[PDB]
Every structure is written in C-alpha cells, then in structure tokens.
Amino acid sequence: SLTADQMVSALLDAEPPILYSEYDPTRPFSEASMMGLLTNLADRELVHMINWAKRVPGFVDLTLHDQVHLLESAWLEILMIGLVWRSMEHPGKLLFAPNLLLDRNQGKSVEGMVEIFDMLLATSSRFRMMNLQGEEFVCLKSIILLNSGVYTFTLKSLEEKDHIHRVLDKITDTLIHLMAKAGLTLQQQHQRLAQLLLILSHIRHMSNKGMEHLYSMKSKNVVPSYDLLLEMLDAHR
Amino acid sequence: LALSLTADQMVSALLDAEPPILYSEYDPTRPFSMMGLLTNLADRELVHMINWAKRVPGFVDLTLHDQVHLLESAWLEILMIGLVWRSMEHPGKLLFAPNLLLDRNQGKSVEGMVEIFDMLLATSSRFRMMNLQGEEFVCLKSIILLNSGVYTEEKDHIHRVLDKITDTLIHLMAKAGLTLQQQHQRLAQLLLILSHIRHMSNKGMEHLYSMKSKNVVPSYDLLLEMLDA
Ligand SMILES: CC1=C(c2ccc(O)cc2)[C@H](c2ccc(OCCN3CC[C@H](C)C3)cc2)Oc2cc(O)ccc21
Ligand SMILES: CC1=C(c2ccc(O)cc2)[C@H](c2ccc(OCCN3CC[C@H](C)C3)cc2)Oc2cc(O)ccc21
C-alpha cells in the first residue's frame, strides 16, 4: 500500500549502521590477522542485517520459514553490495570498516582472495561511473533480499511468491519514481533501471565465487545455519 | 553503424540470427552415458552460438580479443537460457534436443545433476508464467552476451548496445499494449531472471568441474577459431 516516497523513506530509515574493526595502536595491522578481522566484521554485520530485513516492507508478511530461506540465499550478496557501497568513494580500496581499508595487494596475502577483491573493486568502480545514489542503493539491496532465493523455494508457497513479486514490482516503481524526480527522461529512466538491475547479476556472480572461496578455507562454518537465522529472526514478543 | 538501427530493425536482426535446434547424436533403435550425450550436444551447440553472436548488432565492432572474452564469460548462460526457452511448452521436462527430452527423475541419474535440473525447470516455469515472447527472448540472450563479461572505448560501446537493447525491449512491450508502469515492471522482471540464470551458470560450472572430466571451458583458441577471423 506504500507510495514510492513511503517506500524510499522506510528503506532509508531501516539502514544498518557502519561498524568498526577493533582498535589497538599497540597492534600494527598484520596480514596473518586479516581473515580473522573480516570474519569478525561479517558476523557482526549479519546481526544488523536481520534487523534491517525485518524492516523491509513486506518481508515480515512472509512465513518465518521463507524469511530464513531468503536470507540463506541472499546474505553474502547483501554483505557484498553493502561493502561496495561504502567503498564507492575510495578508488582502489575496499572499506570493510572505516579503520579497515584494504587494497588488492593486501588481498594477495590470503590465497584466492585477490580474485574476489578485484570483482568487488570493479563493482565499486561501476557504482562510481553510474553515480549511484543512496536511494537507489537501498532499493537494490532490498531487491536482492526478496529476489535471490525466490526461485529455489505448496498453496502457501504460491501465495508467498505472488506477494514477493508484488513487492518487487513496487520497488521497481520506486526506482522509476526516483529517476523521474532526478529529471531523467523516460528513455534515460528505463536505461538506468536496466543498468542497475544488470549489476545484480554481477553481485550474484561474486557471491557464488565468494562462497566457493570461503568453503575452500576449511573453517568450521561458512554459511549461517537455518537454526541461527531462525533464532535471530524468530524473536519472541 | 548497427546502433543506427530502429527498434523494429533490431528485433528483426535478432530473430533472423537465431541458431538452429540440434539433435542428440545417438541411434534411437538402440537401448537408452547421459553426460556423454549432453556434452556432445553442448559442444555442437556452441559452434552455432558463436555464429549467432557475430550477428548480434554491435558485437563484431569489438576487438576479436574482447569478443572471445565475452563468449568465455557467457557461453554456459546462453546454453542455459536457450534450453529453458525450448523447454517452455514442456512442463516438468528439459528439451535438450527434440529426441532428448529429460525429466527430473532422469536427472537423478547423475550425481549433483538434479539440483541444476530443478533450477532450470523453475526458470522454464517462470518463463511460461510470464508468457515470455520470442522477441523478448532474443533480446535477453543478447544482453547476457554483452553483459556477462563486462566486469572482467570498448566498454562504452558495449553499454551503448546494451542501452539500445533496453530501448528495444521497452518498444516491444509498448507495442504489445502495456502501460508505462507495466513496461518498466516487466523489464525489471525479465532482468531479475538474468541474475538467476547467472546463478545457474555458476552452480553448473561448479558441478561440471566436480565431474573431473577432460575439459570444461572452451579455450581462447577454440573460440577464436570458431569466430573465423
Ligand atoms: C565481502 C566480504 C568478505 C569476503 C571475503 C572473501 C570471499 O571469498 C567472500 C567474501 C569477508 C568475509 C565475508 C564472509 C565471511 O563469513 C564468515 C562466516 N560467518 C558468516 C556468517 C556466519 C554467522 C558465519 C568471512 C569474511 O569480509 C567481509 C566482511 C563484511 O563486513 C562485509 C563483506 C565481507
Ligand atoms: C544446461 C546444459 C547442461 C548442463 C548439465 C549439468 C550442469 O551442471 C551444467 C550444464 C549439459 C551440459 C552443458 C555443458 C557441458 O560442457 C561440456 C564442455 N564443453 C563445453 C564447451 C567446451 C568446448 C567444452 C556439458 C554438458 O548439457 C547441455 C546441452 C545443451 O545443448 C544445452 C545446455 C546443456
């Protein structure tokens, strides 16, 4: 029932905070410590992501089961687009945190990492060339949340999918509204809409390559479990 | 040059450039290697894909080097969307060839295959649900060709062609009688399906690699030879 303006306002209000890496001026940054710091940040960002997701219009209208499925599908894509967004104004660097700004040479320290760094930096550059606006960014991130898991899900399921498609349609309306307000021609509007949504194909690509890379590290866990996501999502009262 | 085409001229060019549907190489008199059949078919399909790519307006304006890199990035996605397209009118089945229609039970035959089968089937179902038209299909396939490798003067040209295809898609929908709102909603719906096709190609590549076959990706030299400089 939201208007385009109401949709933008809700998404902007729902934005999670930018988190920091730990501070210590007695411990100089080490290559050996890098993955540990990144993991610690990612895990903390995930908790805020679940909060954010619950504030995306239409998301909590879904079953808890399907909310979990959508986050299972989208969580790394969402981490990545978030990273690319806060890195946009910093050519050649990834702003994992304001006190953890890394370049591709530092990425070389971890086997297989520089390939993923390069893809993320390329996305940052693309954002920059398009002059991506914050209002557009929060629309794109919401689209990832709703769309990424919708092809891999009963009567209830059909109802859910119809709802997701209607919300996705409203976000399309919202993007078009924003561009119309920016003074773009109708032609420029459709063209930019297309340009923006094609970036999501690259973000999906990066998530899949990234997931493969994280698994190759043979750590205890990579993905947040169904259990964990449910626990974070399945709040009482 | 090819950017000077009208929307109608663009559509006609793409429709005319469509590759043929090939047959599986087996003797139908004999008892029914699935991956063997599929690999043989994919490899033959690839040749026709390269000749199709050369007819996508704007593609051959790129350097041969860049043409090859786009094909390197896009070939599996393009195989997949073509498979989904010809499987649309066959619910629950994948029409790999007219003489090779497989259902998901058949897919189980091969380890790790049914997961990718189900994704392909879901895409075919989505196409049918959206009543995807042939004119839209050829635009989407062209977008995959130009977009899949663009992150890995030339880039400006690629974006110009992509913008032209967007114009063409919107033109088709307007002609179909859709309102402006329906036009940009349907455009978005179609482009979001492309992210799923990318996903499928990613998981498909993982699966093909896990089989530890001889090769998986076509070499630079193979693609370049097919391009016939
Ligand atoms: C994009 C990205 C990272 C990354 C690094 C390599 C790679 O192949 C894919 C993602 C790494 C990264 C990403 C995900 C990681 O998963 C650790 C396992 N956690 C994830 C959630 C679950 C509770 C367990 C560990 C490190 O760092 C980031 C931190 C952020 O706050 C936001 C994005 C990242
Ligand atoms: C989608 C698809 C196939 C497939 C099966 C499992 C999988 O994990 C990914 C793709 C299999 C398939 C797809 C690609 C294959 O690559 C074999 C290696 N070739 C590819 C080109 C290069 C010259 C070497 C082998 C089998 O069959 C198809 C045949 C088609 O004419 C069109 C699409 C396919």
UniProtKB/Swiss-Prot annotation, chain B:
Residues 6-229 form the NR LBD domain. The modification Phosphotyrosine is found at residue 220. 17beta-estradiol binds at residues 45, 86, 207. Widely expressed. Not expressed in the pituitary gland. Keywords: Activator, Cell membrane, Cytoplasm, Disease variant, DNA-binding, Glycoprotein, Golgi apparatus, Lipid-binding, Lipoprotein, Membrane, Metal-binding, Methylation, Nucleus, Osteoporosis, Palmitate, Phosphoprotein, Receptor, Steroid-binding, Transcription, Transcription regulation, Transmembrane, Ubl conjugation, Zinc, Zinc-finger. Phosphorylated by cyclin A/CDK2 and CK1. Phosphorylation probably enhances transcriptional activity. Self-association induces phosphorylation. Phosphorylated by LMTK3 in vitro. A lipid is attached at residue 139 (S-palmitoyl cysteine). Its main location: nucleus. Signal peptide: none annotated. Changing residue 139 to A: Loss of hormone binding capacity and temperature-sensitive loss in DNA-binding. GO terms for molecular function: 14-3-3 protein binding; ATPase binding; beta-catenin binding; calmodulin binding; chromatin binding; DNA-binding transcription activator activity, RNA polymerase II-specific; DNA-binding transcription factor activity; DNA-binding transcription factor activity, RNA polymerase II-specific. Changing residue 220 to A: Reduces PELP1-mediated activation of transcriptional activity. Residues 6-229 are annotated as: Transactivation AF-2. Residues 1-229 are annotated as: Interaction with AKAP13. Changing residue 86 to H: In ESTRR; highly decreased estrogen receptor activity. Residues 1-229 are annotated as: Self-association. It is found in: Nucleus; Golgi apparatus; Cell membrane. GO terms for cellular component: chromatin; cytoplasm; cytosol; euchromatin; Golgi apparatus; membrane; nucleoplasm; nucleus. One of its GO terms (biological process) is response to estradiol. It is linked to Estrogen resistance: A disorder characterized by partial or complete resistance to estrogens, in the presence of elevated estrogen serum levels. Clinical features include absence of the pubertal growth spurt, delayed bone maturation, unfused epiphyses, reduced bone mineral density, osteoporosis, continued growth into adulthood and very tall adult stature. Glucose intolerance, hyperinsulinemia and lipid abnormalities may also be present. Composed of three domains: a modulating N-terminal domain, a DNA-binding domain and a C-terminal ligand-binding domain. The modulating domain, also known as A/B or AF-1 domain has a ligand-independent transactivation function. The C-terminus contains a ligand-dependent transactivation domain, also known as E/F or AF-2 domain which overlaps with the ligand binding domain. AF-1 and AF-2 activate transcription independently and synergistically and act in a promoter- and cell-specific manner. AF-1 seems to provide the major transactivation function in differentiated cells. Belongs to the nuclear hormone receptor family. NR3 subfamily. Binds DNA as a homodimer. Can form a heterodimer with ESR2. Interacts with FOXC2, MAP1S, SLC30A9, UBE1C and NCOA3 coactivator. Interacts with PELP1, the interaction is enhanced by 17-beta-estradiol, the interaction increases ESR1 transcriptional activity. Interacts with EP300; the interaction is estrogen-dependent and enhanced by CITED1. Interacts with CITED1; the interaction is estrogen-dependent. Interacts with NCOA5 and NCOA6 coactivators. Interacts with NCOA7; the interaction is a ligand-inducible. Interacts with PHB2, and UBE1C. Interacts with AKAP13. Interacts with CUEDC2. Selective estrogen receptor modulators (SERMs), such as tamoxifen, raloxifene, toremifene, lasofoxifene, clomifene, femarelle and ormeloxifene, have tissue selective agonistic and antagonistic effects on the estrogen receptor (ER). They interfere with the ER association with coactivators or corepressors, mainly involving the AF-2 domain. This is Estrogen receptor. It comes from Homo sapiens (Human). The gene is ESR1. The chain holds residues 306 to 546 of 595 of the full protein.
